[PDB]
Amino acid sequence: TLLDPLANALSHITNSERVGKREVYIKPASKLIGEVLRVMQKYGYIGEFEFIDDGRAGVYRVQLLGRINKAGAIKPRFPVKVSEFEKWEKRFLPAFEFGILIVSTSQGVMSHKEAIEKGIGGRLIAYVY
Amino acid sequence: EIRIKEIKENKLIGRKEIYFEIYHPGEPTPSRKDVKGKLVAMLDLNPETTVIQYIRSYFGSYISKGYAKAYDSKERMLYIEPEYILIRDGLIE
Amino acid sequence: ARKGPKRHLKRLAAPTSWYIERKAYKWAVRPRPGPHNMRTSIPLLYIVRDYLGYAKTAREARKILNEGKFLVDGRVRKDYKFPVGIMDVVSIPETGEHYRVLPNRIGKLILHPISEDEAFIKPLRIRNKRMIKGARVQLNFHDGTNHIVSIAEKDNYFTSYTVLMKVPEREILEVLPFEKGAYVFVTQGKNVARKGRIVEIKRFPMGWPDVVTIEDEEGELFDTLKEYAFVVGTDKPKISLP
Amino acid sequence: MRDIGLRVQPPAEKCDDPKCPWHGNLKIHGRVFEGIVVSDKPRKTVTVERQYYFYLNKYERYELRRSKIHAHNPPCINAKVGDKVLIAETRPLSKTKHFVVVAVLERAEE
Amino acid sequence: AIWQGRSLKKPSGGRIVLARKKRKRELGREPSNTRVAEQDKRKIIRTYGGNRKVRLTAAAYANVFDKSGKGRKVRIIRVIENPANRQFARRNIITKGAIIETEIGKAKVTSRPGQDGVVNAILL
Amino acid sequence: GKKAPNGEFAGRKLKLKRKKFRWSDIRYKRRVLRLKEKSDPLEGAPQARGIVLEKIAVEAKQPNSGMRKAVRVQLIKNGKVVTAFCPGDGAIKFIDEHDEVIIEGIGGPKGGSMGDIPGIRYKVVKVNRVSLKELVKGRKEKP
Amino acid sequence: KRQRKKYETPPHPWIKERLDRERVLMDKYELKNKKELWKHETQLKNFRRRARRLLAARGKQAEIEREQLLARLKRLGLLPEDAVLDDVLSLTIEDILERRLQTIVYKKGLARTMRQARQLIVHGHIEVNGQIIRSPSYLVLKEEEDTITYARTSPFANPQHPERMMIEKAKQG
RNA sequence: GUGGGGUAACGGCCCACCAAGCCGAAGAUCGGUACGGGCCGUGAGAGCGGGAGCCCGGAGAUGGACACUGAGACACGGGUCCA
RNA sequence: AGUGGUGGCCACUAUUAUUGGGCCUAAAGCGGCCGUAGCCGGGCCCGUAAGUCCCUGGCGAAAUCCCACGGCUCAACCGUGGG
C-alpha cells in the first residue's frame, strides 16, 4: 500500500533521470508536491512543471534538465532550529553550500537558503543535489 | 637608589602607605635597615613610627618592589599593627 | 547528616553578587540574618577590606568597626558580618565619604559615591501591607524594616510603592506611587542596572507575578518582574543612578 | 460562587463538603493540568490520565509517556469516565490524593 | 516511640526498606483520652521549638454556648454519643464532635481537649 | 525490507531492539555480569603473592619442540592453585621450593596462554620480593 | 580535575616520513626534545582549530572572537598587519619556529650557533626590555623584538668579553 | 470515604466504622546492582564508559535499640540496654 | 629523566550499525496463514493550535571548559571582561 507521496515522487524523479528520460509523470499529486516542485525549479534544477487534472488525484508533469545528481525525501521530519542548521548539511549534501534542502516552516514550503536570512526553523522535508 | 610610586594616606588609621621600587642592578639585595634609613631621609619621617613589611625582588629583575608604613604615635603600632614587624625591625626585643 | 543550623560558608559557594577572589582562601565570613536577603547584600567586612582597602587584614577592619567610625544609614554598626543590601547608604563622616550600593549590569554590587545631600534619604519599596491590633496599619519594606501608620492614611500607601525614607531620624518624606510613566530602576533579572519608565502593567494570574514593560531613555522596550522594578522618581530619577 | 481566579464557570449547584474549592474550605494554588478520566470507582475520587511525547537524544524519535493523577472529585461536578477534566494542585488530602478537579470541559457523551 | 513516618508500602503494594532511621521531629505523642471527672486536670508540655501545648486529661466543666452567642460555664454529667467511635462513649472519653449530657441538656463539643486544654460546646 | 522501525513515534521499540541485541555481543555480556570478576582466581588483581609447591615443565605445541619450565603456585590470598610459567635462561634453578613469589598475567590473546605454550595464564615477576629479570641477568641476589 | 598535557604525541612513533621531517627541523633549530616540536605543533593546531571553528560560525561572539584571534596572531609577529581569516590555514610550523626566542636572538647575530644562543639564554644572559628570561622556547611578540639586547649585569654587556669580539666578527663574517 | 486522635504542621501518620479499591505486558512484584548531580576519560563527532579525588544534595558513629537536656539531636570527643 | 611488563576503560570497529551493518551459497527469515495491542497509513476544504517553529520574562549555583587583557621570567595558576 502507498504511504507517502513525496518520497515516492522524489525516488521516481531520481530513478527516471538515472537512465535519463525527458518527461516524467508522478501519479499521486498533492498540494505539498506542488509547493515542493516550486522550490528547486526556482533554482533551475527542473524545467517546466505543471499539474494535470486527471479526475482521481491529479498527475504532475515535469521536464528534466539533467541537473540533479540525487533527490530524495528525508522521511522522519526532523525539526531543526536555525543556529544548528549546519549539523544537517553535512548529512545530505556533498560539499559546502552544494545543493539545497526543503523545510516546511510556519510560512510554507520553501528552500533552506532562503530560510537562513528569513530566520525560521521548521521540519526538514526533502533534499536534492 | 629608591624611587616612589604610591604615597597614600589612611586617615581612619592616620597612617601613610608607601609603595616604592629599589634599583639594584648587579649588586646583592639591599637589607631592611639600609632602605629603612634611606626612605626616612627624603620622606622626612620619624624612624620609630615607620615600619616596613616586605621587599620582593623578582627572578631575573634588577628592580624590586617594597612596601612601608609610616605611623604618627608610638601606640598606634602597639594597638593596630601586628607584633612581628616591630621585632623584624628591632622595634621590640 | 546535619542536625542544626550552621555557622560556616566556603569561599567557593559565595553568592555571585560579590566581588571576591574565590580561590584566594578556603573560608569566607557567613552573613548573619539582617535587613535584606542573601542574594541582595554583602558582609560589611568585605566592603572595608576589599572595596575600600583601608584594612589589609580582617582583624584591623574589625578593630575599626569596633571603633564605630563607619555609619550604616546613620547608625553605627560594629558587627563585622552585617548585611548591606541594595540602596543602603554607607557614610563615613570622617572622610565625609558617602556611597550607595547599586547592582551592576553584570549583577554584582558596586559603590556609587554620592554627595552629602543624598546621604540622609533612603528609598524603600513597600513589600507588604498589614495591620495590627489597635487598628494600626504596618508597612513591611523591601529591606526588612517596618513602619507604623494609622488607619486613616492607609489609602496613601500600596505594596511596591516607593517611600523616600529619612533614615537618620525615621521620618517619612515622600511617597512615589507605582503608575505608568514613573521612572524605574531595575534591581534584578537580565535587565539589571537599567533605568527607564513604566509602559504597561501585565497582570498575571495563577501565582505568576506581574510583568512591567519598561522603556529605556533611548526608547528600547524590555520587560521585567514587578518586584524587580524600583521607582526612583515621578519623571526623572530623584537620586544619582549609574 | 466564590472566585477561584480560573477562567471557568462554576458548577451550578453548590455542595456542603469542606473540600470543594467553590463551596468548601480548601483553596487552589500551584500547577494546573488537563486530562481524561479513566477510573472513578472509589468514593469521590478520580484517576485522570494525560498523554504526551518524550524525546530521546540517541535515536531522535518520540516515546509516548503517560501520567496518572489522583484528584479529588467533589459532588458538585461528579466526574465520570470519558470526560475531559481540569485538575489543580492542592494541600495534601490523603496518602495519594493531592489534586482536585476544578472543571469539566466535555462530558463523556462528547 | 510513636513514629509518624513514611508508609512502609508503596501505593502499588511494593515493599520499601527504610534507607534511614527515625528523626526526632517525626515522632508522635500519646492520645489524651480525656475523661470526665469532678475536677480539671491539665498538663503543660514543652514542644517543638520551645512552644507549650496544654492538654486536658480530666474535665469537670464546659462552655455551653447558645445560638445567640452567649457562653455559660456549666458542668458535665456524662457523654451521650461519640460518632467518632463507640468505645469512647462508654468510657466517658470526650473528643471533638462528641455529644455530652450536661445540666442544660445535650451539647455538641466543638473543641480539641487534647490540644486546646478546654471544653467548648454548643447547646442542641 | 527497510531497516525498521524508522518512525518518529517509535522510540520505545527502536530502543528495546538495540538493548536486546546488545546482549548478542559477548564482551558487553562479559562486563555487565562481571563473570570475569566471578571466575577469576586472581580476583581482578594484576599481581598476587603465592607460595611455590613443585616445579613442572610442559611440551611446546607442535611443530614447536622443547621443554617449557614452570612451577605450581597456591595463592596465599584465597588458596587456589595455578601453574606459573618461569621465563629466563636456566631460571628454574633460581626458583626454589616453597618460595614467596609474585605472579602476574602473561598478556596473551584475551589474556590467554601466550604464544606457543598452552594452558598457562601467568608469569613470575619477583621471587622473595626480588625482580626475576635482573636475576636472569644476574645483577641481584636472592635473599 | 587533573591538569592535562599541553602537547600531542604523533599517532605512530615510527613513520619514516614524519620522523625525517622532524629530524631536519631538529638539526636546523636544535631543540632539546621532540617534546618541544610537538608542543609548537599543538600551538599551531590550536590556532588552526580556532580558525576553522570560527570560519563556520554566525553570530556576534563569533565575530568578536575572530577579531581577538586575528589581533593576537598579529601581535605575535606571525601575520601581516592586514592579514585576514583565510591565510592562517597556509601557516607553517617554521613561522612559529622563527619567532622562538632562541631563533630570534641568533638572527640578531648575538651568537655563533643555535646552541651558543641557547646557552646564553638559559644562563640568564639575554634581556628583554630589561628583564631576564631563561626559556629559549619563549615566543616573542611583534612589539618587543627591538628590546632584545645583552643583559646589563652579564659580563657580555661589557663590550670586551673575549667571546664578544669573536661573536661580532662572526656577525661580520 | 465518614468521624475522630497525635503532630510545629497537612497527610492512614494513627484509631472506629463504611466500601472494594490501588498497581501490572509502555515491565508491577521479586531479585541483582548501586549514594544522585556539577562533572571526568576517550573519541572528528553521533556516542561509549565512569561518578574515589574539589562543591552541592542524601546518609551513617561496631551491628542493633532507647530516652533526657536543648531553638536546633536520639547527640563522634553527652547518656542508658543486648551482643 | 625518563623507560619497560601487566591489569581496567575509549578508539581502532560500520565487530552494536539513529547518523550507519547483514540474513540465496559464509552465524543469521520461524513450514504456512489469521489476528489484538502497538507502529506505519489516500486526496481536497474548513476549524483548533497540542506537537512544530520565531520573539520575549523568570530560571539551571559555584567549580570546570573556550577566548582577549593583566599579575607572578613566561607557563601552569589567579583576576577583569565575553561566551
CSV table of N, CA and C in Angstrom, one decimal, chain C residues 105 178-187 191-200 212-224 228-238 241-242:
chain,number,residue,atom,x,y,z
C,105,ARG,N,25.5,46.0,35.9
C,105,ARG,CA,25.0,45.4,34.8
C,105,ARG,C,25.3,43.9,34.8
C,178,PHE,N,3.2,53.6,42.1
C,178,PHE,CA,3.5,52.7,41.0
C,178,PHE,C,2.5,52.9,39.9
C,179,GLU,N,2.8,53.8,39.0
C,179,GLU,CA,1.9,54.1,37.9
C,179,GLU,C,2.6,54.4,36.7
C,180,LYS,N,1.9,54.3,35.5
C,180,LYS,CA,2.5,54.4,34.2
C,180,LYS,C,3.3,55.7,34.1
C,181,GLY,N,4.5,55.6,33.5
C,181,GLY,CA,5.3,56.8,33.3
C,181,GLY,C,6.3,57.0,34.4
C,182,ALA,N,6.2,56.4,35.6
C,182,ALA,CA,7.1,56.6,36.6
C,182,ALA,C,8.5,56.2,36.2
C,183,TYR,N,9.5,56.9,36.7
C,183,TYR,CA,10.9,56.5,36.5
C,183,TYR,C,11.3,55.3,37.4
C,184,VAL,N,11.8,54.3,36.8
C,184,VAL,CA,12.0,53.0,37.5
C,184,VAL,C,13.5,52.5,37.2
C,185,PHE,N,14.1,52.0,38.3
C,185,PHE,CA,15.4,51.4,38.2
C,185,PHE,C,15.3,49.9,38.6
C,186,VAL,N,15.9,49.1,37.8
C,186,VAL,CA,15.8,47.6,38.0
C,186,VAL,C,16.8,47.1,39.0
C,187,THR,N,16.4,46.1,39.8
C,187,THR,CA,17.3,45.6,40.8
C,187,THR,C,17.8,44.2,40.6
C,191,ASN,N,17.7,42.4,32.9
C,191,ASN,CA,17.7,43.8,32.7
C,191,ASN,C,18.2,44.6,33.9
C,192,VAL,N,19.1,43.9,34.7
C,192,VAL,CA,19.6,44.6,35.9
C,192,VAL,C,20.4,45.8,35.6
C,193,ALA,N,20.4,46.8,36.6
C,193,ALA,CA,21.1,48.0,36.4
C,193,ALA,C,20.7,48.8,35.2
C,194,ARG,N,19.4,48.7,34.9
C,194,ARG,CA,18.8,49.5,33.9
C,194,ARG,C,17.8,50.6,34.5
C,195,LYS,N,17.6,51.7,33.8
C,195,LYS,CA,16.7,52.7,34.2
C,195,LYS,C,15.8,53.1,33.1
C,196,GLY,N,14.5,53.2,33.3
C,196,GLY,CA,13.6,53.6,32.2
C,196,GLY,C,12.3,54.1,32.8
C,197,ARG,N,11.2,53.9,32.1
C,197,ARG,CA,9.9,54.4,32.5
C,197,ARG,C,8.9,53.3,32.2
C,198,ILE,N,7.9,53.2,33.1
C,198,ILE,CA,6.9,52.1,33.0
C,198,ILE,C,6.0,52.4,31.8
C,199,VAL,N,5.7,51.4,31.1
C,199,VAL,CA,4.8,51.5,29.9
C,199,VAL,C,3.5,50.7,30.2
C,200,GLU,N,3.6,49.4,30.4
C,200,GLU,CA,2.4,48.6,30.6
C,200,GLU,C,2.6,47.7,31.8
C,212,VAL,N,6.1,44.2,34.2
C,212,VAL,CA,6.1,45.6,33.8
C,212,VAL,C,7.0,45.8,32.6
C,213,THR,N,6.5,46.5,31.6
C,213,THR,CA,7.2,46.8,30.4
C,213,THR,C,7.9,48.2,30.6
C,214,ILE,N,9.2,48.2,30.6
C,214,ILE,CA,10.0,49.4,30.8
C,214,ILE,C,10.6,49.8,29.5
C,215,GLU,N,10.5,51.1,29.2
C,215,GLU,CA,11.2,51.7,28.1
C,215,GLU,C,12.4,52.5,28.6
C,216,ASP,N,13.5,52.3,28.0
C,216,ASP,CA,14.8,53.0,28.4
C,216,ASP,C,14.7,54.4,28.0
C,217,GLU,N,15.8,55.1,28.4
C,217,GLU,CA,15.9,56.5,28.0
C,217,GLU,C,15.9,56.7,26.5
C,218,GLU,N,16.5,55.7,25.7
C,218,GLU,CA,16.5,55.8,24.3
C,218,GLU,C,15.4,55.1,23.6
C,219,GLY,N,14.4,54.6,24.4
C,219,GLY,CA,13.2,54.0,23.9
C,219,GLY,C,13.2,52.5,23.7
C,220,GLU,N,14.2,51.8,24.1
C,220,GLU,CA,14.3,50.4,24.0
C,220,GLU,C,13.3,49.8,25.0
C,221,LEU,N,12.4,48.9,24.5
C,221,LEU,CA,11.3,48.3,25.3
C,221,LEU,C,11.8,46.9,25.8
C,222,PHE,N,11.8,46.7,27.1
C,222,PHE,CA,12.1,45.4,27.6
C,222,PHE,C,11.0,45.2,28.7
C,223,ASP,N,11.1,44.0,29.3
C,223,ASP,CA,10.1,43.6,30.3
C,223,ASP,C,10.9,43.1,31.6
C,224,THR,N,10.2,43.2,32.7
C,224,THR,CA,10.9,42.8,34.0
C,224,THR,C,9.8,42.6,35.0
C,228,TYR,N,11.1,43.4,40.8
C,228,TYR,CA,12.5,43.9,40.4
C,228,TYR,C,12.5,45.4,40.1
C,229,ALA,N,11.4,46.0,39.8
C,229,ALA,CA,11.3,47.4,39.4
C,229,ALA,C,11.2,48.3,40.7
C,230,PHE,N,12.2,49.2,40.8
C,230,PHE,CA,12.2,50.1,41.9
C,230,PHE,C,12.0,51.5,41.3
C,231,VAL,N,10.9,52.2,41.8
C,231,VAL,CA,10.6,53.5,41.4
C,231,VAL,C,11.5,54.5,42.1
C,232,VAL,N,12.1,55.4,41.3
C,232,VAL,CA,13.1,56.4,41.8
C,232,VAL,C,12.7,57.8,41.5
C,233,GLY,N,11.6,58.0,40.8
C,233,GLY,CA,11.2,59.4,40.5
C,233,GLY,C,9.9,59.4,39.7
C,234,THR,N,9.2,60.6,39.8
C,234,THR,CA,8.0,60.7,39.2
C,234,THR,C,8.2,60.7,37.6
C,235,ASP,N,9.1,61.5,37.2
C,235,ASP,CA,9.5,61.5,35.8
C,235,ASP,C,11.0,61.4,35.6
C,236,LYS,N,11.8,62.0,36.5
C,236,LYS,CA,13.2,61.9,36.4
C,236,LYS,C,13.7,61.3,37.7
C,237,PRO,N,14.9,60.6,37.7
C,237,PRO,CA,15.3,60.0,39.0
C,237,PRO,C,15.7,61.0,40.0
C,238,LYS,N,15.2,60.7,41.3
C,238,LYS,CA,15.5,61.6,42.4
C,238,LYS,C,16.8,61.4,43.0
C,241,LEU,N,21.8,57.8,39.8
C,241,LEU,CA,21.8,56.4,39.4
C,241,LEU,C,22.7,56.2,38.3
C,242,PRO,N,23.8,55.4,38.4
C,242,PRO,CA,24.6,54.9,37.3
C,242,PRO,C,23.7,54.3,36.3
